[PDB]
Amino acid sequence: EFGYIYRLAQDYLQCVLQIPQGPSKTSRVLQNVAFSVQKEVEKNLKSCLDNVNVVSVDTARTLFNQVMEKEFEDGIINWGRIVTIFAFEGILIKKLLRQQIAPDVDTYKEISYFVAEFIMNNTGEWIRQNGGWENGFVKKFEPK
Ligand SMILES: *CCC(=O)N(c1ccc(O[C@@H]2CC[C@@H](NC(=O)N[C@H]3CCNC3)C2)cc1)[C@@H](C)c1ccc(Cl)cc1
């Protein structure tokens, strides 16, 4: 359901922004894995990320749509690709915090909405068939 995925996307942005939320076991596991992916993307794509300014929520939405088109270009879905969506929204929110021309403290609420909309509509059916978040994602990524 949308509400569950919106809460995961909002919880991850609050984790990256260092603001209080507590989160479910699914959200706790996702925060750990997505942050590890995010730090690896930030190191490997440093020069690339520094060349593009994200000064509005509309710019962030357009960049997000272009990134998703390339991430899923071959029509394949897997859990690693889904974790990368959350790592990506963490990078977008860090750029918007620094660069948003009209700062708005509620912007993270709009980014997590369009991330939840993408996940539900484009990957939701695959997620349910693969166990959902509690029997699919958590089972694969929770500590050994
Ligand atoms: C230099 C590229 C560019 O100009 N981008 C851009 C920035 C980031 C970006 O990140 C995606 C998400 C992480 C990485 N994908 C993967 O690691 N995928 C794995 C997962 C399993 N299969 C492979 C790439 C892509 C492109 C622009 C559009 C951009 C700049 C700055 C910001 Cl804040 C956003 C976008």
Side-chain angles (χ1 to χ4, degrees), residues 2-20 22-39 41-42 44-50 52-127 130-139 141-143:
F2 194 103
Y4 193 92
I5 299 172
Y6 175 77
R7 184 56 187 271
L8 295 177
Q10 191 176 257
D11 284 354
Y12 185 70
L13 288 196
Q14 290 174 152
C15 166
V16 170
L17 288 176
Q18 288 213 87
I19 47 176
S24 64
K25 178 196 199 186
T26 297
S27 191
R28 289 164 176 271
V29 173
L30 177 56
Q31 290 170 223
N32 171 55
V33 181
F35 184 70
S36 179
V37 172
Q38 187 177 330
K39 296 311 290 182
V41 171
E42 283 173 16
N44 295 145
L45 276 64
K46 190 182 196 327
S47 68
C48 142
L49 291 168
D50 286 352
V52 174
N53 304 149
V54 185
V55 300
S56 63
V57 164
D58 288 359
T59 298
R61 194 181 321 246
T62 304
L63 293 168
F64 177 82
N65 290 345
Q66 292 164 228
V67 170
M68 293 301 102
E69 295 184 46
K70 291 295 283 191
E71 290 302 313
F72 294 98
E73 187 171 25
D74 57 11
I76 295 171
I77 301 164
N78 62 44
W79 289 117
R81 293 184 182 199
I82 288 162
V83 168
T84 296
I85 300 173
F86 290 96
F88 186 67
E89 62 148 16
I91 290 175
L92 281 180
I93 207 64
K94 286 174 63 164
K95 297 219 104 219
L96 278 158
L97 186 174
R98 188 74 190 81
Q99 295 172 334
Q100 182 172 42
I101 191 62
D104 185 346
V105 286
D106 278 339
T107 294
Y108 78 87
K109 288 175 175 159
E110 307 192 93
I111 306 297
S112 42
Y113 180 98
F114 70 63
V115 166
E117 178 190 24
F118 177 82
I119 297 173
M120 181 185 78
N121 292 331
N122 298 89
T123 72
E125 190 57 31
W126 183 91
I127 290 171
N130 286 271
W133 299 95
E134 294 173 343
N135 293 288
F137 178 68
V138 172
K139 297 311 210 304
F141 291 84
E142 69 185 346

